[PDB]
Design a protein around this ligand. Structure first.
Ligand SMILES: [Mg+2]
Length: 491
């Protein structure tokens, strides 16, 4: 069964999940392995918010450990999403490309809203959600608020209220009440930024509140040990633990009275003494402003959401395919290709093909089928079932197109298709290269919004793309330009 590796790069730490899909095409997975790396990019940002070469080194090291664990488990490629620290760094795009060059993995920045939607799915995989749920996810950089029902987020708000960010924003003095003063000021900042949107996430009869990520997990462990319990490692973690806003307030008042070095010795807060005071003030102030009385902590988060969405995309693509095209996908899988990438390239290829047809481009009847198959097979190294021998030669020549044919036209075994077929191969290859460029970062997120004639050329509007995707289209769209005319890409 399919083995998949997903990872997220946050502000305090990075996380990897390796899992195997469950039989029945039902969108489920079994966990194989998990890893956390204390990357702490938020402590590697200069005054303008740029990630330093030290943070780049810590990023590359995390992604190298991740890539080795995935390879060690047969997972193959690792999809990597990145949140607040890379998102906000003026040099974020340049840093992500440099890290790809050093590790092979590309940390693709996602929006706060998509971060929230995916985190909620991970929470859904770990704890019991009801008809009306509010999730708070506090990281080092940002705080997401998410409201939804039993299956997915309906509303997401992202605010710059992260724990690292707030610790650095409100430097602590050395007085007796210096801790309380930090806690009060952080809470005022929380209310100031949350007041205009709080109604969207406020408690109503029956609302359940949930918390994810490291601060909340540390708070749950520390609160349970204050109730008389053992360290969270017994009971298998803190997943599904509940605590009250009163227990949180009491933990916060205790932390506030201690100096930073004593905070590291509070049970359950041992690995978070430096940011924990501001982090607990954020959670208390935000929950209090929404009227929450009790929370449930979830160990599921962003990486579990990425896995669900990836399996969902793959299995939805596979389900709607014809029997013949499904056998191509199974063949490609046996060739060890990445099925998430192949499905996305084929869906993007169909989208571009269909718009060209709408704008009056002419194609022969089997063109869409040939393009789909070559899109699924494009990364099979072995090959450079419902298809006749001509169609399979066409597919192979589309999948491995080059301007200089590896075998010279005079070389024995050179395969010279008829002129109409030569023309078809290049046009469809030109589409396939543009689609491949749109999933260069392996995010599965790109979408075609519009494709229109622009003089003797074309204008393409896309969403869900990274800087790496946009550059891929520029580099690989030369063939499109030679066959369809100049192509400009937007958004
Ligand atoms: Mg590709």
């Amino acid at each position: 069964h399919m083995r998949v590796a997903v990872a997220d790069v946050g502000t305090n730490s990075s996380h990897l999940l390796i899992a195997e899909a469950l039989p029945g095409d039902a969108g489920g997975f079994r966990v194989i392995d998990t890893l956390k790396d204390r990357t702490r990019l938020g402590e590697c940002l200069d005054t303008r918010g740029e990630l330093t070469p030290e943070g780049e080194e810590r990023l590359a090291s995390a992604l190298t450990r991740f890539r080795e664990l995935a390879a060690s488990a047969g997972a193959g490629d690792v999809r990597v999403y990145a949140t607040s620290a890379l998102r906000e760094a003026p040099n974020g795009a340049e840093v992500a490309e440099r890290v790809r060059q050093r590790t092979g993995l590309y940390p693709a920045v996602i929006s706060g809203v998509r971060e929230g939607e995916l985190t909620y799915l991970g929470v859904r995989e770990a704890v019991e959600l009801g008809p009306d749920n509010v999730l708070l996810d506090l990281g080092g950089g940002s705080l997401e608020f998410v409201r939804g029902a039993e299956e997915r987020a309906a509303d997401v708000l992202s605010l710059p209220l992260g724990a690292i960010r707030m610790t650095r924003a409100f430097p602590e003095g050395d007085g007796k009440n210096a801790g309380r003063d930090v806690a009060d000021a952080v809470a005022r900042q929380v209310r100031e930024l949350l007041r205009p949107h709080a109604g969207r996430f406020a408690a109503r009869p029956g609302t359940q509140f949930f918390l994810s990520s490291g601060t909340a997990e540390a708070a749950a462990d520390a609160i349970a040990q204050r109730r008389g319990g053992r360290p969270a490692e017994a009971a298998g973690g803190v997943n599904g633990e509940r605590f009250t806003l009163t227990e949180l307030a009491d933990l916060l008042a205790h932390v506030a009275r201690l100096r930073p070095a004593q905070r590291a010795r509070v049970p359950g807060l041992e690995r978070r003494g430096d940011t924990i005071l501001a982090a607990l003030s954020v959670l208390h102030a935000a929950l209090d402003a929404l009227g929450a009385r009790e929370v449930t902590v979830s160990e599921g988060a962003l990486r579990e959401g990425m896995l669900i969405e990836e399996l969902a995309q793959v299995q939805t693509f596979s389900l709607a395919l014809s029997t013949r095209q499904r056998s191509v996908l199974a063949t490609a899988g046996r060739f060890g290709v990445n099925l998430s990438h192949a499905g996305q390239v084929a869906e993007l290829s169909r989208e571009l093909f269909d718009r060209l047809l709408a704008a009056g481009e002419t194609f022969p009847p089997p063109a869409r089928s040939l393009l789909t198959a070559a899109a699924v097979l494009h990364e099979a190294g072995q090959i450079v079932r419902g298809f006749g021998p001509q169609d399979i030669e066409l597919i192979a020549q589309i999948a491995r197109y080059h301007r200089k044919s590896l075998p010279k036209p005079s070389h024995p075994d050179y395969v010279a298709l008829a002129p109409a077929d030569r023309a078809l191969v290049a046009r469809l290859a030109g589409i396939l290269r543009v689609a491949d460029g749109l999933d260069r970062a392996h995010t599965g997120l790109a979408r075609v919004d519009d494709l229109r004639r622009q003089g003797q050329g074309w204008q393409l509007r896309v969403s869900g793309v990274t800087p790496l995707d946009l550059a891929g289209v520029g580099e690989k769209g030369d063939l499109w330009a030679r066959e369809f005319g100049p192509l400009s890409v937007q958004n």
